[PDB]
Sequence to fold (763 residues):
Amino acid sequence: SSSEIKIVRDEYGMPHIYANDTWHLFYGYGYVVAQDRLFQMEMARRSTQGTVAEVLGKDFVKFDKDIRRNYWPDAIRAQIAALSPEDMSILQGYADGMNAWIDKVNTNPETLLPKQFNTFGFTPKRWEPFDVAMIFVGTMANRFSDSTSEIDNLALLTALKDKYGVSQGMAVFNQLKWLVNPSAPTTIAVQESNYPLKFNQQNSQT
Amino acid sequence: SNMWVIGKSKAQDAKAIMVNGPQAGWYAPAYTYGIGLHGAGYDVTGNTPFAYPGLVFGHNGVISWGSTAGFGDDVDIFAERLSAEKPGYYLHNGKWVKMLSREETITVKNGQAETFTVWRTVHGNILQTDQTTQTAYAKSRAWDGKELASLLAWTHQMKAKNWQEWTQQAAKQALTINWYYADVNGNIGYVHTGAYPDRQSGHDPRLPVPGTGKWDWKGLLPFEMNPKVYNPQSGYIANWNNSPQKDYPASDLFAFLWGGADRVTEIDRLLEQKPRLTADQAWDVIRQTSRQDLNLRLFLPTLQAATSGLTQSDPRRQLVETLTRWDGINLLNDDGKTWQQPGSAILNVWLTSMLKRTVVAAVPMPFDKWYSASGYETTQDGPTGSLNISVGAKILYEAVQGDKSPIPQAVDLFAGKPQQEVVLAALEDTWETLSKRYGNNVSNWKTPAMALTFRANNFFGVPQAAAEETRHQAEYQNRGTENDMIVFSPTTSDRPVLAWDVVAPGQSGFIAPDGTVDKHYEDQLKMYENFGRKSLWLTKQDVEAHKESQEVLHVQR
Ligand SMILES: [Ca+2]
Fold:
């Protein structure tokens, strides 16, 4: 049956989904996630979109503002709209699966609603592909692949150059924040290959 | 985040072994989510952060995969030129271009909502900080516009059955992440994935560039450029957020460096120590690295040289002698709160003093604060993440290497003073400090151990559970938030692959309205604590045989 989703949990409660097509597979995935981590996922949703204050209050306003200033939702929505039907099915299915469980939770909250929702004073709503995507986008990307301190670095260099003079200053910056260090232990051994690009270490852009 | 992949040339009783320890801090409920998918081209098992559609840590019976943050430089900042007479515009390629803008409203529970505008240029979103009437900085990410592509690349890679099909997906993952491969035939691989900009000549990637146009990126470098290796001569692939490859530049973060001093040496050492390792030995590398003081190996030689000529009774001498007899492997005393050996406290005090005397002394304030951390700093609840060698310590390490360091010491961190003298002065400080606190009998010093906390707030600092749900573990372990190992072609099993993982506190974070905690709410907590692990099932028969419950859904899209 193309419309059948089998969910089997092992001795540790770990779910295994069995389904024929893409939409149903990830529907089953979202369903079990909603069963297992609904509050965690709801709050992760809020963390990645900057809507925590909506439920937690004023102490999270600055948090919210920072999240929203760090991304462009429309651009994410546009990448989603450009998805092939097959790829779209991953997110739509996942979103839908969560919604199926969430609808049951909101129907019989006296038995299915995770206690944290009662405690924090609100109820869970439905998810869309955007929501699912932002879980990944807001964590893995906006946070684990978004590291820079170039403005601070320029301030350090500027102070080094003021303290030690220009040539010396540049030299000391390359001693404290070297671009590359050849003695660095690397995952790929020098016998295998080396990186061919050479970079400017003089801040020649000024 | 660490990972070691042991290939056929180094695997015992197996063809390949993969042990991954992603490190994002510790949380309750669990940072990752156990999931198995079977159908529509997928057949996988493993676990993944925030239950991403794509499993970051898992296998499909043919290959297995993992990740550790890459920390390559994939972000540059563009200094945009503004005009007071043209608010909302910026000069680009000789024309005042209109910035993108949007209104946002922060709704606040029990508070007044707040409305503000977010601005963006062709280089990226505008930072709030460092703004003037004439300037604003834009954060330019090489992966911009490729977020979704990375999410899917992470999904589709799970269907790969060989290095060629897998690197095809690695090429689409644009974030700066190290990906690892292993397969049932003993092959192993590594790709430092991600989009990296093809910068103009003269562009120093550690500093901002003008956003007027002349400095715009030429595009993105091709996959050919990404550091990668398939079946390395070494027979292994080890990573702990260290450099992927010789001459490959790190993140521009001032607090981040790839230098002679790197914690990954701790893994390389244990892997090379033994010609071949078994699955259990590979797993044991978790327990050893998680207890390994990371500074001892780096500074012990320097400490020895400085004290080698002192007389027996010199206390600076005995502190160093204490370190020499130590393997740097911390263990808890029976009391469950102090360490058996005082080595890390010694190194912490000494190191803190060295940085103050050297690096901190040569850097103008307030930038000097950036190099003062010893790397042992923590709170009552213990580290919020992994322990690493601090940036100050890595700089100090090059200085003590003298001419063995490839980094020119433009300025002398020792400012003309003999290194021995400064190392001794620091040892003196250490002795005064610790002897005053613990007494003068080193042998009965019970210094504080680090503990570990599974926090109820997620890495963002946002509650993902009630406070009371926080869990505690007496022994801090510098190890993965989760650990998973996949063993290919194990000779003692009837299966062509075995896999294990640990998702603490448990698979479920559910608590019923009456407060009844789910059966799998905390059943992996003690297991995590004692370096235990549970089997990950893949085949239908294994899953069926280990079934606890089952449910069938019938749905029409
Ligand atoms: Ca940069």
